[PDB]
Amino acid sequence: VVGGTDADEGEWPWQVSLHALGQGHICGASLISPNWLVSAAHCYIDDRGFRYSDPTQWTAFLGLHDQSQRSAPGVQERRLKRIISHPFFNDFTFDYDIALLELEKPAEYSSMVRPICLPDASHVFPAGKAIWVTGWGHTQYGGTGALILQKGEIRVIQQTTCENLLPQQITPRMMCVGFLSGGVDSCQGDSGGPLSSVEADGRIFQAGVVSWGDGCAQRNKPGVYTRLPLFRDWIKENTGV
């Protein structure tokens, strides 16, 4: 996250860190039930050096604050049983950039570990609404990951404006969130984490999944996120949640 601040300990108890064995933190995810996470499909694609698609290659840390303190009280370590990447994902366009991760043993709910609420299929997160991005990604483009979980406040951008900022790249699964003036944005290593939106009684709902961007925090280049209401039924069908 560029332009953000340190989160308070336990402020985002649905935020999860996904480590690939031997490589440290790669992506984020969100806790949605005792057994399931939501993340981004693009994080789980094999390359010639490493099989990112193989669930046995990963560790999820729940309740984490600081990447240098992964055994702190309240942090839970879990392996993955399965990675379900959306069947329509493609790694060229990044359309359908969403995956479901099945924990190998359930999470234990606590003050540090709590699921995010999922929005119904019909719910609209309106243009202009302030929402939050969180993660351990880079704090400047090309820069370094944060040890401490970061948060940043960003606003939903109108879809036609988003399309025109990133021509021939924005599908209806995507939404731009940020500022035309730049300054606050997601960045490398934030992918897969949740957008958190404060709803009408103060409960937080997941608005989207950190997906991609052109650079980070640049003028006229807000980050791109996968919309969540579109996938509510797909989540139910694949997870029972």
Ligand SMILES: *SC[C@H](NC(=O)CC[C@H](N)C(=O)O)C(=O)NCC(=O)O
């Ligand atoms: S909607 C998912 C979360 N709800 C719960 O974990 C219910 C737990 C207890 N029954 C309770 O204390 O009410 C949730 O509300 N997450 C978002 C949030 O803002 O905390």
